[PDB]
Design an enzyme around this catalytic site. Sequence first.
Site, PDB file in Angstrom:
ATOM      1  N   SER A 285      38.651  28.466  45.283  1.00 45.92           N
ATOM      2  CA  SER A 285      38.498  28.556  46.726  1.00 45.92           C
ATOM      3  C   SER A 285      37.094  28.224  47.219  1.00 45.92           C
ATOM      4  O   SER A 285      36.892  28.122  48.426  1.00 45.92           O
ATOM      5  CB  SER A 285      38.896  29.944  47.226  1.00 45.92           C
ATOM      6  OG  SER A 285      40.268  30.203  47.006  1.00 45.92           O
TER       7      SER A 285
ATOM      8  N   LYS B 180      36.916  25.307  49.649  1.00 43.65           N
ATOM      9  CA  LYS B 180      37.125  25.433  51.086  1.00 43.65           C
ATOM     10  C   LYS B 180      35.912  24.952  51.885  1.00 43.65           C
ATOM     11  O   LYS B 180      36.069  24.445  52.993  1.00 43.65           O
ATOM     12  CB  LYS B 180      37.513  26.865  51.466  1.00 43.65           C
ATOM     13  CG  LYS B 180      38.942  27.227  51.063  1.00 43.65           C
ATOM     14  CD  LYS B 180      39.372  28.598  51.576  1.00 43.65           C
ATOM     15  CE  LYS B 180      40.860  28.895  51.274  1.00 43.65           C
ATOM     16  NZ  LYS B 180      41.097  29.004  49.807  1.00 43.65           N
TER      17      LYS B 180
ATOM     18  N   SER C 202      40.063  33.722  52.732  1.00 46.50           N
ATOM     19  CA  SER C 202      40.509  32.765  51.714  1.00 46.50           C
ATOM     20  C   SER C 202      41.995  32.446  51.856  1.00 46.50           C
ATOM     21  O   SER C 202      42.757  32.520  50.894  1.00 46.50           O
ATOM     22  CB  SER C 202      40.209  33.282  50.307  1.00 46.50           C
ATOM     23  OG  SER C 202      39.988  32.181  49.443  1.00 46.50           O
TER      24      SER C 202
ATOM     25  N   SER D 291      33.784  33.298  47.768  1.00 50.58           N
ATOM     26  CA  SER D 291      34.328  33.635  46.460  1.00 50.58           C
ATOM     27  C   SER D 291      35.367  32.612  45.990  1.00 50.58           C
ATOM     28  O   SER D 291      35.963  31.892  46.794  1.00 50.58           O
ATOM     29  CB  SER D 291      34.977  35.014  46.491  1.00 50.58           C
ATOM     30  OG  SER D 291      36.078  35.008  47.385  1.00 50.58           O
TER      31      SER D 291
ATOM     32  N   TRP E 178      38.505  32.308  42.615  1.00 46.89           N
ATOM     33  CA  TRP E 178      39.088  32.728  41.349  1.00 46.89           C
ATOM     34  C   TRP E 178      40.153  31.703  40.962  1.00 46.89           C
ATOM     35  O   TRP E 178      41.253  31.651  41.533  1.00 46.89           O
ATOM     36  CB  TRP E 178      39.662  34.144  41.450  1.00 46.89           C
ATOM     37  CG  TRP E 178      40.197  34.721  40.160  1.00 46.89           C
ATOM     38  CD1 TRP E 178      40.510  34.047  39.008  1.00 46.89           C
ATOM     39  CD2 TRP E 178      40.498  36.098  39.911  1.00 46.89           C
ATOM     40  NE1 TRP E 178      40.987  34.928  38.060  1.00 46.89           N
ATOM     41  CE2 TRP E 178      40.984  36.191  38.591  1.00 46.89           C
ATOM     42  CE3 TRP E 178      40.388  37.266  40.673  1.00 46.89           C
ATOM     43  CZ2 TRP E 178      41.370  37.402  38.024  1.00 46.89           C
ATOM     44  CZ3 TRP E 178      40.770  38.466  40.109  1.00 46.89           C
ATOM     45  CH2 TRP E 178      41.257  38.525  38.796  1.00 46.89           C
TER      46      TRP E 178
ATOM     47  N   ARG F 193      32.935  40.096  41.372  1.00 41.80           N
ATOM     48  CA  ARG F 193      32.106  38.908  41.602  1.00 41.80           C
ATOM     49  C   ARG F 193      31.074  39.137  42.706  1.00 41.80           C
ATOM     50  O   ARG F 193      29.880  38.882  42.521  1.00 41.80           O
ATOM     51  CB  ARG F 193      32.973  37.698  41.946  1.00 41.80           C
ATOM     52  CG  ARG F 193      33.701  37.096  40.742  1.00 41.80           C
ATOM     53  CD  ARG F 193      34.953  36.353  41.175  1.00 41.80           C
ATOM     54  NE  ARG F 193      35.891  37.238  41.853  1.00 41.80           N
ATOM     55  CZ  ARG F 193      36.717  36.860  42.824  1.00 41.80           C
ATOM     56  NH1 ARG F 193      36.755  35.591  43.221  1.00 41.80           N
ATOM     57  NH2 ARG F 193      37.507  37.756  43.397  1.00 41.80           N
TER      58      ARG F 193
HETATM   59 CL   LIG Z   1      38.666  34.369  45.788  1.00 41.76          CL
END
Ligand SMILES: [Cl-]
Length: 243
Positions: free
Chosen positions: A46, A49, A93, A184, A186, A226
């Site tokens: 992500s 983005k 997100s 963030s 993942w 994170r």
């Molecule tokens: Cl994320």
Amino acid sequence: SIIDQNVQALFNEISADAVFVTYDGQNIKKYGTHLDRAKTAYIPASTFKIANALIGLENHKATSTEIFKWDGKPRFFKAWDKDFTLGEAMQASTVPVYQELARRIGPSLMQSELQRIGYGNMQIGTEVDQFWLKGPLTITPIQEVKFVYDLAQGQLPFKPEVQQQVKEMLYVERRGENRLYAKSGWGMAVDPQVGWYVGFVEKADGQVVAFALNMQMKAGDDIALRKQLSLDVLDKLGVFHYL
Ligand SMILES: [Cl-]
């Protein structure tokens, strides 16, 4: 350097291989438990983005105020079952909104734009709404920090206002006159899984320190780690002191 020792101790807690990269416009510094991760490429997940928003705004596929409407069909997360601007979707997100944006851009333009701006390996394959989640697009933590450093300073190859609007989509919090911007990621759909926390700290006087946490993830890991680890590191470094 006791400050370096303090930072490294934060990683003593953590079994996962991890690197934390900083960039101040002059020097790259690396911290963590596997420093070679800094120059290794991973799917952006992500964190893509940021680039998606820039490309979408630059090429008139969206604006920063446009509302992406939810059609009423439940999404994977209840948190996503609402209308979003690109900025709201950035902080939540909201993958389906950015997949819609990617399909507006289309594969030919997405590919030519990633090549134009030199983002990672610039490869998108054949699914324009999957390449950042599944590969084949990959990017190193050093490439990420230089990308967002340039965003912070308005030096990416996009219009000034395009960059400024995407910059504020990333805004998280301020402490005194210091501002934190971050995103963030993942990458769950690949092996090994990759975890990201990428962004920068801006001071009132204009100085910027960009950063990227990059670490191995696995099923069941703590989703909050994170950001928490990144904030702990930035505090130990004195880049973003806790109040
Ligand atoms: Cl994320």
